[PDB]
Design a binder for these strands. Structure first.
Ligand SMILES: [Zn+2]
Ligand SMILES: [Zn+2]
Lengths: 36, 138, 144, 114, 138, 134, 97
RNA sequence: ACACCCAG
């Protein structure tokens, strides 16, 4: 019922490439090659 | 005052008549060839770099104003004569005009003897001439 | 021209004299308020992270030329020659006409980023205002 | 939302994580400059691209002789009756067939989309 | 007050010849220069060529401070003129013509990748990750 | 104290200079005057909410010019000089930028056409010969 | 037949077969430009209020219109309304343009 | 060889 339909994603705890660009790279994977 | 709507048909065709009486039908061919001889050919000769020579004596061949004459034909006698456009079509001639360049030659040598000699209207070949242009005979 | 395979656009910007990223993006991005054009120039900056001087940028350009040099100064001089005399000759061919070249190359990418964003319509080839006609004037001057 | 440039080597800042305080830290990765920011945002992307076209319309378009003019829609903060209307007709705008109105009065670049 | 209707009216003077020639420092507005920090300035011609047709090199506060390169503008002042009006106790403005225009850009000081090192760095074309770690090795 | 040292004592005094761009006819008239001591006169007037700057030509030189200002915040300009003794020095920092325009709007065109004619005076075009060269 | 061939390329006259659409003819009033030197136009623009390209900073370009003479960027201007009114008047009077 | 051109 919220007007701002907010969905929150966070990475797993025990995580050489940093997470500042890993979360960029996986966000592109979610919106290109993921089937709902 | 102001062109009335019923008088516009006469007015527009008078305007077009003034265009074709002044400009013509093949004006794009003549204007481009006129700018080529009057402006472009002069610009190529000026933009061309001077010739430097060594081996000491030094020579500079500076180029100058282009002179272009009427289209002439040289017979077997070597006597020049103005080529007619009809004669070119008949005797299979080429309707070309001589191209004369002005060259100033300056010698550079030790001993304070820089002599500047000048050759007037050196013949450097013929250029085909568009008919009914400003540089044609007609 | 006179280069075999393609080079990144931030390399030739650093070869032109402006090496800092502030000077490069001031040449391309005229207003920094919009983030969209700054977003698509971000991958181009990441590709050119290796090159940091002007001289090494000239070395990278000359190493990919049609005539490979021998010494380091040989391909730098050759790359500076093609960066100056055969890169945008209509902007200017002179020893100190490099700021005008980068502004035009800044306008090169700025026209490219606007079309990728769709801010202006792509210029079609068959538009006849994008055409010129060679009459007997320019044709005979090309022979002469 | 926006990245400032380096005060030392005039390069572009980039996000970096620090373990001493766990705060956002824009760090230039060419030199060794350090900077703490307060925006706390790295990347935003308009997926449905609901970009406000009213800002990107140049206010000087109203004097184009090739654009239509109607007095049906008056200016809001200007009061002039006639105005210049057109469509954006650009990519990344979905339908891009809804009118944008620009007032034609001098020294009034007010644009409303209605 | 007097400043609301101030009447100031000064004389302009153009000297014929001057023992010193005048040029221009130009700096970017985003460079954020400060003249109070500058306790030492060194200006010399660069050694990249190895004279008058060479770019200028500006060194400020030695190697500790910032360094700049002066580049002459592409255009020429054939049809344009620039003059500087200098304040003087006598009040007669002295119009000084310019000789040349120089533009200055800062040079970053930090460890910079060698060209031989850069070619070894170029294999990882798009597979390069953690660009922070590139400067950690150097 | 060195040959390559730049003197910046003028910058420390906060000296203010004005950078002005003038047309060619004003510079040519000043050059033809050969620096007698006075070639023109400057008129500055300030109102309650607007400032106007104008330049008045000398009546001897002829036998008004507005100096509308420009934004200075775009760049940082300072002026320096080099001497015949190779002593680099700086006068000051440019504070206000000005530009000059001719007052005539429609009658100025006849002077411009003569300037174009003088500019096209030394240019050459290929002539025509009535007779072939022998 | 593109939309911009109105008035200077004949929409009717075109040869048949392999050459159709590629060999075109001028209209009755079409006049191909002969060319001119861009020096008087560039001299007029620098005389006017147009600022030079190297003179400006790369920050005032956004609120100004770029000037292109023969496809070469030569500077910016801040008053485009007065510039077109001046340039079009000078072409109609045939003074310098 | 190239241009131009006829027919569908
Ligand atoms: Zn930095
Ligand atoms: Zn309004």
């Amino acid at each position: 019922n919220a007007e701002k339909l907010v969905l929150r994603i966070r990475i797993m705890n025990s995580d050489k490439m940093d997470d500042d660009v890993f979360l960029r790279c996986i966000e592109s994977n979610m919106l290109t090659d993921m089937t709902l | 005052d102001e062109i009335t709507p019923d008088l516009w048909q006469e007015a527009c065709w008078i305007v077009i008549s003034s265009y074709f009486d002044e400009k013509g039908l093949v004006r794009q061919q003549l204007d481009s060839f006129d700018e080529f001889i009057q402006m472009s050919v002069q610009r190529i000769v000026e933009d061309a770099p001077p010739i430097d020579l060594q081996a000491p004596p030094r020579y500079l061949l500076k180029f100058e104003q282009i002179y272009l004459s009427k289209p002439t034909h040289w017979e077997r006698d070597g006597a020049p004569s103005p080529m007619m456009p009809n004669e070119a079509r008949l005797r299979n001639l080429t309707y070309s005009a001589p191209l004369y360049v002005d060259i100033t030659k300056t010698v550079i040598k030790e001993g304070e003897e820089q002599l500047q000699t000048q050759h007037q209207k050196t013949f450097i070949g013929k250029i085909p001439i568009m008919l009914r242009s400003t540089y044609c005979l007609l | 021209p006179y280069i075999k395979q393609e080079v990144p656009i931030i390399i030739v910007f650093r070869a032109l004299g402006f090496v800092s990223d502030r000077d490069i993006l001031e040449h391309i991005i005229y207003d920094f308020e919009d983030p969209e054009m700054m977003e698509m120039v971000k991958p181009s900056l990441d590709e050119a992270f290796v090159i940091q001087e002007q001289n090494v940028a000239l070395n990278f350009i000359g190493s990919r030329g049609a005539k490979p040099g021998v010494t380091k100064e040989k391909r730098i001089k050759y790359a500076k020659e093609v960066l100056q005399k055969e890169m945008l000759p209509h902007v200017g061919v002179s020893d100190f006409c490099e700021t005008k070249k980068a502004y035009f190359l800044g306008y090169m990418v700025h026209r490219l980023l606007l079309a990728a964003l769709g801010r202006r319509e792509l210029d079609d080839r068959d538009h006849y205002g994008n055409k010129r006609l060679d009459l007997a004037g320019p044709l005979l001057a090309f022979l002469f | 939302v926006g990245i400032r440039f380096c005060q030392e080597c005039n390069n572009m800042l980039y996000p970096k994580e620090d373990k001493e305080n766990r705060i956002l830290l824009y760090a230039c990765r060419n030199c060794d400059y350090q900077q703490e920011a307060d925006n706390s945002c790295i990347y935003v992307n308009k997926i449905t691209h609901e970009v406000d076209e009213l800002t990107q319309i140049i206010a000087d378009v109203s004097q184009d002789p090739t654009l239509p003019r109607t007095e049906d829609h008056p200016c809001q903060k200007c009061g002039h009756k006639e105005a210049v209307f057109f469509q954006s007709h650009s990519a990344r705008a979905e339908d891009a067939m809804r009118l944008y109105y620009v007032c034609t009065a001098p020294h009034c670049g007010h644009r409303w989309t209605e | 007050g007097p400043s609301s209707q101030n009447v100031t009216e000064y004389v302009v003077r153009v000297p014929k010849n001057t023992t010193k020639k005048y040029n221009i420092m130009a700096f970017n507005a985003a460079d954020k220069v400060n003249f109070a920090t500058w306790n030492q300035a060194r200006l010399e011609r660069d050694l990249s060529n190895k004279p008058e047709d060479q770019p200028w090199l500006l060194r400020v506060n030695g190697k500790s401070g910032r360094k700049f390169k002066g580049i002459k503008k592409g255009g020429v002042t054939e049809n344009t003129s620039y003059y500087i009006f200098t304040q003087c106790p006598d009040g007669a403005f002295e119009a000084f013509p310019v000789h040349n225009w120089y533009n200055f850009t800062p040079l970053a000081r930090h460890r910079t990748l060698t060209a031989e090192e850069a070619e070894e760095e170029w294999e990882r074309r798009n597979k390069v990750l953690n660009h922070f770690s590139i400067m950690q090795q150097r | 104290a060195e040959r390559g040292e730049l003197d910046l004592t003028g910058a420390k005094q906060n000296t203010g200079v004005w950078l002005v761009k003038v047309p060619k006819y004003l510079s040519q008239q000043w050059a033809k005057a050969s620096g007698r001591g006075e070639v023109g006169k400057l008129r500055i007037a300030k109102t309650q909410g607007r400032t106007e700057v104008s330049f008045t030509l000398n009546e001897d030189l002829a036998n008004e010019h507005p100096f509308v200002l420009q934004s200075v915040g775009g760049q940082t300009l300072t002026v320096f000089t080099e001497s015949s003794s190779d002593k680099l020095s700086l006068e000051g920092i440019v504070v206000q930028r000005a530009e000059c325009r001719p007052a005539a709007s429609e009658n100025y065109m006849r002077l411009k056409r003569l300037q174009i004619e003088e500019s096209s005076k030394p240019v050459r075009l290929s002539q025509q010969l009535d007779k072939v060269v022998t | 037949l593109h939309n911009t061939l109105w008035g200077m390329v004949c929409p009717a006259e075109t040869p048949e077969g392999h050459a159709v659409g590629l060999v075109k003819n001028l209209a009755l009033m079409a006049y191909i430009s002969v060319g001119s030197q861009p020096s008087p136009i560039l001299e007029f623009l620098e005389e006017w209020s147009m600022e030079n390209l190297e003179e400006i900073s790369p920050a005032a370009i956004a609120d100004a219109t770029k000037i292109f003479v023969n496809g070469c960027w030569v500077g910016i201007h801040k008053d485009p309304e007065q510039l077109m009114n001046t340039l079009r008047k000078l072409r109609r009077q045939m003074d310098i343009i």
